[PDB]
């Protein structure tokens with residue numbers, strides 16, 4: 064069986080008005096072989112701003128996290144940046 | 154409150170480190186407990202009710218793979234003395250940068266070693282991911298290490314096999330740089346639980362592990378005692394403020410709100426801060442984290458704070474916030490750092506200008522000059538002005554950032570003194586900043 068890692072990505076909006084539902088739908092629409100989207104929650108980071116924290120399981124040899132982060136960040140209308148909140152081997 | 158420490162668990166794919174780490178989190182923490190509960194109940198089907206923790210761990214893994222579990226990848230567990238934030242090191246190649254510039258650097262590394270003859274040898278290969286991880290930890294100053302020889306059941310808890318493994322592993326880690334005498338070697342069974350939390354009854358010859366510390370010799374029997382014996386590291390609370398920005402928001406009726414992790418010092422409302430490399434100075438109106446407003450943000454806190462007369466446009470990700478009246482952060486003309494070249498399909502010559510990731514900065518920096526090549530472990534200068542670097546070399550290099558950049562010497566501000574060098578879809582080197590030519 065293939066090596067996997069479970070990753071929790073933080074996806075940040077532009078402001079407190081950003082449509083977070085559209086933002087997460089855009090992330091989940093991203094399809095790649097070896098990529099499995101998991102649970103997500105909108106977490107407050109202060110001053111009314113909420114970030115998207117979403118889990119995903121990736122096959123190490125098939126899914127580039129650098130590329131994945133870059134792809135999410137293409138949704139400029141909703142995403143300011145992305146960061147890895149945490150990652151573990153499975 | 155229990156003190157906080159970070160631990161990274163490394164080892165070869167067949168070492169069984171995931172089951173090992175999972176067992177600790179399962180019995181000493183509370184991660185995805187509702188999933189655990191479901192499987193503990195289901196296990197009644199196996200017989201009349203009895204179940205192995207390793208079975209439950211197996212089912213949790215598959216559940217996580219389906220993407221239906223609820224908890225995030227930030228895992229923690231407790232010991233008598235600590236709340237441990239643990240990372241079962243991913244094999245993923247992108248984890249290398251994350252290990253270098255990510256938050257939560259390790260206070261101790263736990264190397265899990267498979268005891269089987271074939272698996273043991275495969276694990277200490279000179280080109281293995283496990284050695285790279287060990288090297289990275291050592292290079293980043295993770296001086297505390299614990300070794301657990303797993304799968305002792307597969308070699309029938311044989312004392313001689315354990316001793317030979319300790320011998321060869323000591324050689325392995327010594328070449329990396331760790332002094333084996335300070336490393337506890339714990340024979341365990343991650344699957345059967347031997348010496349995990351309770352002492353084993355399968356090895357009469359086992360007297361326990363031991364390690365030399367500065368105060369004396371510490372001994373124990375289990376992996377948990379080994380972890381609990383990790384030495385308390387000193388935190389940056391006392392050093393000047395340093396808060397790398399991750400994001401900057403423009404919130405109506407409030408203004409500019411940068412967000413970032415407090416790496417050193419403390420941020421409080423009322424302080425007057427400066428943002429480097431821009432050089433903008435202002436007062437901190439308020440600070441917030443999650444739902445609560447704070448009286449202070451301490452090292453480790455990812456906080457958002459509000460400042461006035463600062464268009465979001467004048468400060469950005471990568472900039473560093475600090476105290477304007479206590480060694481304020483500054484940009485630099487250049488910085489000299491010890492670079493360790495990792496295994497990669499290439500060779501480095503002066504002029505090389507790859508992207509460098511340092512705290513939240515992502516900037517291409519020129520390897521302006523190859524000042525010296527050094528013995529990696531001792532730091533002794535082997536030659537002046539080497540003409541190129543190849544995998545394995547440790548060297549002092551003069552860097553010139555292509556964009557305004559704020560960095561620190563690793564000795565003074567660790568989180569802003571270590572960096573990852575990216576190229577060929579991988580981290581090709583790791584640097585530790587030794588001096589900075591600041592900007593005035």
Ligand SMILES: Nc1nc2c(ncn2[C@@H]2O[C@H](COP(=O)(O)O)[C@@H](O)[C@H]2O)c(=O)[nH]1
Nearest residue numbers: 168169170171172304306307342343344345
């Ligand atoms: N014999 C034996 N195998 C183990 C032990 N702990 C883990 N393993 C096995 O080692 C392999 C995996 O490690 P993991 O996949 O959990 O990192 C699996 O095949 C797992 O069942 C142990 O104490 N004894």
